[PDB]
Amino acid sequence: LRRHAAPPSTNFEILNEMLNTRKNMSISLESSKALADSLDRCVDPEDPYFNTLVRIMSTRCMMAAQYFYSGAYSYPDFRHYGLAVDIYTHFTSPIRRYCDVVAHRQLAGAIGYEPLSLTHRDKNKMDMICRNINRKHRNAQFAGRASIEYYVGQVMRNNESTETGYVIKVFNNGIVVLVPKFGVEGLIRLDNLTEDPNSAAFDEVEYKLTFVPTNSDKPRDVYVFDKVEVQVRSVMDPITSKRKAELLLK
Amino acid sequence: KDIEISASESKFILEALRQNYRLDGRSFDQFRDVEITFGKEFGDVSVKMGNTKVHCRISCQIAQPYEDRPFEGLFVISTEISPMAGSQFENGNITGEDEVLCSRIIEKSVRRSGALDVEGLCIVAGSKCWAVRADVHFLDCDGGFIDASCIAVMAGLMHFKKPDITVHGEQIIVHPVNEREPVPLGILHIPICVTFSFFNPQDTEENIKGETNSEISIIDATLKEELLRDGVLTVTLNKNREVVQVSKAGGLPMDALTLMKCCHEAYSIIEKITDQILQLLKEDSEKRNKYAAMLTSEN
């Protein structure tokens, strides 16, 4: 089977903190339907992409779904939060998923087509299969996302363009902006963020970072969830040899 | 105390077998109709095969696991015989040949086979766990004690429900059934025993050196057939098409292919029996729920 644990309150307390402070909103977390409804109404009229940004950000604070065998947990633990179903499994993709292969053999024995192999009726062997495909699943998505990272990083290799960015993380050492066009997150250090780093201030209560831009002299307050203009640029670090995307806001 | 069997009765029952006749009118490969009755409490089950009557009771109590197995709970099976099943049985005779065999067959079929999830009997590792006990009561004996007990134990374990326990630190909080519903046991597989009885229609010489085999084998013998057999075979299987255990402890030498035939014949029986048990458990659950709805409605 395959279950999905309900997200802890601690994961959304930080998101609701930024929402209630800046946008004056909140996510219920009372139920999956409550979480969905509150996430749905979380939309800014001046910018349609704001709702998408919150969704792609509230996805990062969800518990990882995992494969398992029905003897390892009780029935209420079979619950899949993200789908709101009492029970669920992978079966439709035998070719690209070995979990389906197991499900196929079990269904064949379920209908009486052919007796189920002993290896799929051993609680010990099933535990090894589940712990393996869980690890291979994580390694698959990470390798997949890394493949996107390299090719996109090669597109912006020798190119600079003013794209649309969104502030997702605010710190005293700088900010982190997300470019939806390339799907790449970038870090703008305080030294390259503004002039006179000793004059800049960070308010944790409001998630606001006030500073004076390098090409200006007017105190600008940069809050969170703000749509800002950002110049993209790629440079391979001479120490890590990883193609990172250096971003300069405007 | 002995059971006296005349030469006439010995010759008659054996000759009947030579004419494809058994006294109860069954078929050599025919298993007796198994009737399963559940009591009011969970774990209370009564199994009946013809005149054979056995009763099993499942119980559990908070106990501490062995030092060797801190993650496993305790599980024991009791099958003490009494003169109630017949004066042939001595009260408390737990060392007799047939008694120890029967005790060992059940143990290897349920305990050793891991039919019960003993790992799920642990509350807190190396400290407190559940101690499940299966007490078999032999009420009336007409043969097939081993098969009746294996069904009685399994039907009981699958019908039993233990009270919910919440544990904080040292303290144990045993929730009563009314406040919260009880929790069923974990069954890895459902073992069913089928016992074969062998009869030599000729003499020992034709059994040892005889060319063509002629030994008769019948399924689930009654008391009279059991007292006149020359060999016994108890084979345990499950719906997963696997042999849980086989025990032909001596007796009449039997052809290997014939013993294999018995194992395949027993598989067809254990399939029907297993499905039967499951159905009677569903209906029992539907019965208890329908009464729970009629109790809440009027309430």
Side-chain angles (χ1 to χ4, degrees), chain A residues 1-29 31-45 47-122 124-217 219-232 234-241 245-249, chain B residues 1-93 95-170 172-178 180-271 273-289 291-293 296-299:
Chain A
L1 264 47
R2 177 177 176 88
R3 55 190 276 254
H4 180 251
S9 296
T10 63
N11 301 23
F12 281 89
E13 278 185 9
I14 177 178
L15 189 63
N16 294 330
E17 174 181 348
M18 303 184 302
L19 286 179
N20 187 267
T21 300
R22 181 58 184 174
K23 291 289 184 176
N24 197 261
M25 290 182 296
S26 177
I27 312 181
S28 182
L29 266 296
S31 65
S32 59
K33 186 179 182 181
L35 189 149
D37 295 329
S38 54
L39 187 62
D40 204 329
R41 59 185 178 184
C42 184
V43 53
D44 184 87
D47 183 29
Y49 186 76
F50 174 75
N51 178 269
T52 308
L53 176 61
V54 180
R55 273 189 159 90
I56 200 178
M57 182 173 42
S58 63
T59 308
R60 286 188 172 91
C61 52
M62 278 295 171
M63 294 283 92
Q66 65 174 194
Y67 300 108
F68 73 106
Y69 63 96
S70 55
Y73 299 92
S74 186
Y75 187 80
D77 290 25
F78 293 173
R79 180 71 174 184
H80 193 290
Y81 190 86
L83 295 174
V85 292
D86 289 322
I87 191 175
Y88 189 81
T89 196
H90 269 175
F91 177 80
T92 59
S93 295
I95 310 175
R96 54 181 179 91
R97 293 199 299 253
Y98 186 80
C99 165
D100 296 32
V101 176
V102 180
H104 267 247
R105 299 177 189 174
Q106 290 184 338
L107 181 61
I111 66 177
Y113 180 86
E114 191 174 13
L116 181 58
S117 182
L118 311 182
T119 60
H120 297 340
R121 291 141 53 196
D122 195 337
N124 178 79
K125 285 187 173 60
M126 285 294 296
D127 184 30
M128 297 297 298
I129 297 175
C130 292
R131 288 199 296 176
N132 172 260
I133 63 181
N134 281 328
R135 185 177 60 89
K136 296 278 97 178
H137 177 83
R138 175 181 290 100
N139 293 9
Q141 287 183 338
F142 271 141
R145 287 184 287 267
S147 183
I148 311 293
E149 178 186 358
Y150 165 72
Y151 275 156
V152 171
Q154 281 297 300
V155 172
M156 314 174 306
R157 184 174 182 177
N158 298 327
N159 291 90
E160 295 179 347
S161 60
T162 60
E163 305 293 338
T164 300
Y166 290 83
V167 182
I168 53 183
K169 293 179 179 179
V170 188
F171 296 161
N172 50 15
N173 289 337
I175 57 177
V176 178
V177 288
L178 168 63
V179 183
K181 183 68 180 295
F182 295 88
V184 180
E185 303 187 5
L187 172 62
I188 309 182
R189 196 173 187 174
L190 188 63
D191 299 327
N192 301 89
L193 176 69
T194 189
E195 183 178 2
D196 289 345
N198 289 337
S199 59
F202 179 35
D203 186 88
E204 179 64 27
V205 187
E206 290 285 340
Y207 282 92
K208 180 207 308 179
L209 183 57
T210 169
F211 59 88
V212 296
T214 309
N215 289 337
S216 179
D217 63 273
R220 176 187 178 182
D221 292 26
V222 180
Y223 314 92
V224 81
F225 307 153
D226 294 341
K227 177 177 63 179
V228 295
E229 184 179 4
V230 46
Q231 176 194 12
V232 298
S234 300
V235 45
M236 186 191 65
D237 189 82
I239 294 169
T240 64
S241 297
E246 274 283 63
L247 305 186
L248 294 178
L249 84 174
Chain B
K1 310 180 186 302
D2 303 324
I3 298 185
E4 315 291 351
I5 302 179
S6 61
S8 302
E9 184 174 343
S10 300
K11 292 178 300 180
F12 181 83
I13 298 185
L14 187 55
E15 179 61 23
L17 292 173
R18 278 185 285 239
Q19 304 187 18
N20 296 132
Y21 285 154
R22 38 196 308 190
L23 276 59
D24 66 331
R26 274 189 291 142
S27 180
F28 296 162
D29 64 334
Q30 182 179 352
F31 200 94
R32 273 181 293 185
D33 289 336
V34 43
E35 306 175 9
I36 302 177
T37 288
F38 302 100
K40 190 186 67 174
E41 302 295 353
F42 293 113
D44 194 310
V45 53
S46 301
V47 172
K48 191 175 303 176
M49 292 184 185
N51 302 333
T52 290
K53 306 179 192 65
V54 298
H55 170 256
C56 183
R57 182 61 177 274
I58 308 300
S59 66
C60 64
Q61 57 183 358
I62 305 298
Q64 50 189 12
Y66 295 93
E67 293 177 350
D68 303 332
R69 298 296 183 266
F71 293 94
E72 293 184 344
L74 305 183
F75 178 49
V76 72
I77 303 179
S78 170
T79 53
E80 285 199 10
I81 207 72
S82 73
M84 173 174 296
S87 295
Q88 295 85 0
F89 309 109
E90 301 289 341
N91 180 36
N93 183 26
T95 56
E97 292 188 355
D98 299 87
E99 284 74 18
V100 178
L101 279 186
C102 172
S103 175
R104 285 292 293 163
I105 302 303
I106 301 302
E107 202 275 347
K108 289 181 291 187
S109 293
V110 179
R111 273 274 300 272
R112 184 195 181 104
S113 67
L116 177 59
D117 196 337
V118 290
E119 291 183 343
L121 263 53
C122 184
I123 311 174
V124 282
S127 301
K128 300 176 183 300
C129 68
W130 279 115
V132 173
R133 157 168 285 269
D135 292 326
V136 174
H137 308 144
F138 301 97
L139 305 173
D140 206 329
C141 183
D142 194 24
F145 275 172
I146 296 179
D147 302 343
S149 295
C150 186
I151 296 186
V153 174
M154 288 311 302
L157 288 172
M158 298 179 59
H159 182 264
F160 183 78
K161 299 177 185 302
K162 62 181 185 302
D164 184 1
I165 303 301
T166 299
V167 175
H168 300 291
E170 295 85 357
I172 303 301
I173 308 181
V174 63
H175 294 83
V177 175
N178 289 337
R180 295 176 64 186
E181 293 177 350
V183 174
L185 294 178
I187 280 75
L188 306 189
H189 62 114
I190 309 174
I192 304 294
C193 291
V194 179
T195 297
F196 293 76
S197 303
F198 307 117
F199 299 85
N200 182 24
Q202 185 64 60
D203 65 333
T204 304
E205 299 60 0
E206 203 146 356
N207 173 255
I208 304 295
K209 299 296 183 181
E211 300 183 5
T212 63
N213 306 336
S214 61
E215 295 82 3
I216 303 301
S217 63
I218 67 179
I219 308 192
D220 188 28
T222 64
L223 179 54
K224 277 177 161 47
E225 300 170 340
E226 178 173 319
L227 295 171
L228 297 178
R229 64 186 174 191
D230 297 285
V232 206
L233 170 68
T234 306
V235 49
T236 309
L237 311 96
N238 64 34
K239 289 194 63 179
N240 289 337
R241 185 176 179 83
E242 63 185 342
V243 171
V244 171
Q245 70 89 38
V246 168
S247 179
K248 189 189 175 305
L252 182 63
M254 209 71 182
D255 179 34
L257 299 186
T258 302
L259 298 179
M260 282 305 303
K261 180 206 65 179
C262 295
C263 294
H264 284 83
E265 286 185 10
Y267 180 64
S268 302
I269 302 181
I270 64 101
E271 183 178 2
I273 292 181
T274 301
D275 298 337
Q276 180 175 348
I277 298 177
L278 295 170
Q279 64 180 20
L280 301 182
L281 282 169
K282 174 188 297 181
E283 299 171 1
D284 176 86
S285 183
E286 293 172 345
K287 183 178 179 180
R288 293 176 184 266
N289 289 337
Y291 177 80
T296 305
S297 64
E298 183 178 2
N299 187 340

